[PDB]
Design a binder for this molecule. Structure first.
Ligand SMILES: O=C(O)c1c(Sc2ccccc2)c2cc(Cl)ccc2n1Cc1ccc(Cl)cc1
Ligand SMILES: O=C(O)[C@H](Cc1ccccc1)Oc1ccc(-c2ccccc2)cc1
Ligand SMILES: O=C(O)[C@H](Cc1ccccc1)Oc1ccc(-c2ccccc2)cc1
Length: 263
């Protein structure tokens, strides 16, 4: 029933609003003008780092290393809030715990990038809960291989943002991503597909109601999941070049655990 689906949509949204201080609405409100300092080069980064506690040993490290060490902090927090949102998805806590961990290891960064897109435009990304703006070309200018981390997230975000989703849309779309039945190592595929198919109905209903003059938005949205797997795939391959060139780069053990036996 359309009444059941709108209930599921509403449930996911209320749960999404509860778990994620980063919302498209707030991000868009900052990019609309409804103030942030701009890091566009080395000089402006140093000025800006002050205006956004880390040990002195970590502070004395290379700029490139420091930028990706610090994003890690918001990253692991995202993985925790994403994990809690997952549990609030009907049926998920009833999956086998091995399958719960597997969907979540494969899914968290696709969601992180989906939510990250709200903060990017074709020129830069809102940082520090919207207080700052770091440019895409300055990220590209970082020492190799660091200059290559972010550029494929920008290319996705420009296209993902062109669809003008609401948070109420994204609440369902990210639930769909977590409950993907074809992740490697899933024991019970069909209970997972059982929930997702029902989530794909909610998402379809939600797009027809929220985007009535856009007939194939659903199709475009579902394809972006291919973009996200490719961005994770690329991102992980880059982490190993970072294990071979960089050593002092302090990876976070939860990120280590997620990136084990993955793609
Ligand atoms: O903590 C931040 O605000 C931040 C950071 S941390 C940071 C930012 C600028 C200078 C030093 C550290 C970050 C780094 C990159 Cl390459 C891209 C986006 C970044 N952001 C924005 C961001 C938003 C959400 C999430 Cl999960 C991670 C990062
Ligand atoms: O610091 C945090 O707890 C979160 C972590 C998080 C990151 C991605 C998805 C879910 C959670 O990161 C944020 C990133 C941006 C923002 C934000 C807030 C207001 C306007 C724009 C961005 C808030 C939190
Ligand atoms: O993998 C992740 O969770 C993050 C994702 C992310 C990266 C930038 C902005 C928002 C999210 O990307 C990273 C890139 C490099 C590193 C890192 C940290 C310490 C040592 C080596 C690499 C950690 C995270």
């Amino acid at each position: 029933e359309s009444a059941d689906l709108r209930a599921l949509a509403k449930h996911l949204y209320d749960s999404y609003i509860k778990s994620f201080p980063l919302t498209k609405a707030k991000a868009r409100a900052i990019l609309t003008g409804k103030s942030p300092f701009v890091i566009y080069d080395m000089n402006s980064l140093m000025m800006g780092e002050d205006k956004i506690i880390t040990p002195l040993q970590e502070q004395s490290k290379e700029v490139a290393i420091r930028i990706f060490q610090g994003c890690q902090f918001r990253s692991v927090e995202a993985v925790q809030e994403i994990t809690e949102y997952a549990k609030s998805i009907p049926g998920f806590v009833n999956l086998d715990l091995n399958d719960q961990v597997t969907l979540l290891k494969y899914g968290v960064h696709e969601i992180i990038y989906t939510m990250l897109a709200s903060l990017m435009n074709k020129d830069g990304v809102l940082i520090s809960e919207g207080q700052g703006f770091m440019t895409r070309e300055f990220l590209k200018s970082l020492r190799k291989p660091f200059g290559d981390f972010m550029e494929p997230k920008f290319e996705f975000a420009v296209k993902f943002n062109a669809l003008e989703l609401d948070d109420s849309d994204l609440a369902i779309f990210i639930a769909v991503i977590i409950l993907s039945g074809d992740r490697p190592g899933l024991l019970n595929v069909k209970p997972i597909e059982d929930i997702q198919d029902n989530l794909l109905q909610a998402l379809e209903l939600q797009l027809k109601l929220n985007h009535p003059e856009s007939s194939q938005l659903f199709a475009k949205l579902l394809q972006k999941m291919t973009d996200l797997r490719q961005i994770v795939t690329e991102h992980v391959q880059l982490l190993q070049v970072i294990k071979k060139t960089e050593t002092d780069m302090s990876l976070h053990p939860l990120l280590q655990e997620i990136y084990k036996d993955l793609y």
